[PDB]
């Protein structure tokens, strides 16, 4: 079974491709299971790009549980988290899939890119809490 044969890359992730994708969140998980530079799954998110989804969809897609969109997606869902954007306005990314700022940026000015969540946490602020965990 199975179109892709010797399909891409899963690595030795803790998450593991065990849910069927389910169309957004666990797909980050597929993302992440598949590529342990760009996704986590781990974790909530990191900076990644949003035009790397194509990049993924070389990849990622249909190897398991998705069809593009549905993964596009995820590359919303998680990609509306902080997390992310704790650096992702440039190649803050620092991924298309392989690990290249979606090929955008060096790191040195992603590195604002790094620091444009200091401008978020900064609006954000108030609280004690913000980036607290």
Known sequence: MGSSHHHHH???????NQPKLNS?????AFLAERFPHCF???GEARPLKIG???DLVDRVAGEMNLSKTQLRSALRLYTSSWRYLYGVKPGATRVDLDGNP?????EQHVEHARKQLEEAKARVQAQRAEQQA
Do not use: Y
Not at 102 to 106: A, F, I, K, P, S
């Open 52 to 54: 790397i989804f194509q």
């Open 102 to 106: 979606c090929g955008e940026l060096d």
């Open 24 to 28: 957004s969140k666990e797909v980050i």
């Open 40 to 42: 986590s799954a781990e």
């Open 10 to 16: 899963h690595s030795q992730d803790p998450m593991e």
